[model samples]
Target: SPQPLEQIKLSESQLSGRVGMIEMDLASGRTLTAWRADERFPMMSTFKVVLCGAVLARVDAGDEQLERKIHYRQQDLVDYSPVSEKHLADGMTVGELCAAAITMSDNSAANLLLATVGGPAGLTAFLRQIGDNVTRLDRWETELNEALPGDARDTTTPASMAATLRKLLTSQRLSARSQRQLLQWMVDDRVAGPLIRSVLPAGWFIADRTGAGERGARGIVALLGPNNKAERIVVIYLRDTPASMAERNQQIAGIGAALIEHWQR
Candidate 1:
């Protein structure tokens, strides 16, 4: 059974700057929200999820193969990317790039996949094809590093992000195997820090992704399900917060704990 939306309490003051969130009961299609979910915020590395989707869509269309190998170029290296730093002279397959992008929020891997998918225009077209008009990828990771104004960077609304996650699960956009692969990458995320996973109940499995930027942009999208339950829950939190990243993550954990408690009840 679904709980009343009013039963869930979120403290706006506890969260610094603007916050947008959505909690959806997958079995019933009911949704709960806080603040302005329709407003767009800097997606930062969260955009990599869309990049992964776009690339997989190509694979579905027979345009690319997961096993195809890609060599890393010196020019492709970018600062603030652990994957790039580790694989400077090595190369990776398409599937490996997707895993690195989602699991580690690897900027260079994201850029490589974005270029393979045909750049910002390609990602934007894919988003529009899926009825996501509010999400935009205006520049690559390299250009984004220059600290372009907010309006010039990638952006997505909480609502749009939630829709994207739903589509990934139900729209048949990617083959079942591909979908499972993507979800597994998120579940196996080695960097599973204290955002969404921090508050999940025992035995609950959460397929989630986290993103952050130097400019105080942080966000997370997660799907949660306990081993004994039939229902699945999706939660999204996006913030254009001016506080430190540590503080923002703590706020996310607090809100996530509250929502999980309500749903589990």
Candidate 2:
């Protein structure tokens, strides 16, 4: 039996701006959502996940290979990137680029992979193929140096993201090997924080991606489960909080804890 979704709630004082969340029972396909999950918000680096999916979709189609290499020029380097910054001279393979993009949130690596997969237009095409028309990636990281004033910059709704994740996990759009690789990259992510990690229960594993922008946009999409368990939970939290980043982190942690407690009961 599932718990009452209404029992999981957050106070307005804990939130500074708009908040959107969705929790899905993977086994049953039942979902719980709050705060306009259908409304769009700037997805920030979270869209990198889609970039990976697009590339993998091609890989599944025999058009690409993980071992295929790409040279990283100094010109490809962007701000807020540690992996690419360090390895700019060494360069990397497609698989390595995808790993850096997912694990370290490496902007340079993400942009390189985006270009490899056919740039913003190609990514948009892939999203459309997957029936996710609301999410848009019109520009690259160099252009998104600063977060836009509103949710108008590269937007996606919580519900749309949930659907995307579901397709990745449940549909045959990606090969099993591709799905495992993507999920493992997310599982190895080193950037997620209090939002999804600081509140998880023991024995639960999470495969996730996180994104944050300067103007208080922060979010995470995660798959949670016990080791080797068939039943998994999908949790997505996106917010545009005007408060300090710390405050926003706290709200996310609080809400995550509440949801975990409610579902784990």
- TM-scores for every predicted model: 0.86, 0.88
lDDT of each: 0.70, 0.73
lDDT of 1 by residue, 1-265 (tens): 1232332224345444666677666555566654467876777777777888888888989999989988887777775577756776668889989988888878788888999988999899999998888888888885543323356457777778877877765567789977777667777676663444555667766777777665566677777766734255444444544676677776666666655566544
Query: How many clashes (backbone N, Cα, C below 3 Å) per candidate?
Result: 0, 0
* Residue 252 lDDT, candidate 2, scale 0-100: 63
Give candidate 2 misplaced runs (Cα > 4 Å). 1-12, 145-151, 193-199, 226-239
Q: Give the Cα-based TM-score of candidate 2 against the true structure.
A: 0.88
Q: Name the regions of candidate 1 deviating beyond 4 angstroms.
A: 1-11, 142-152, 193-199, 228-235, 238-240
Candidate 1 lDDT? 0.70
In the range 1-265, model 2's lDDT, one tens digit per residue, is 1233432244334554667777776556666545567877777788888899998998888888899877767876888778777776666888988999888889898999999778888888889999997888888985752456553657788778878877876686898899888878887888873335555666667777887876677777777666535355444444555678777766666666565566554
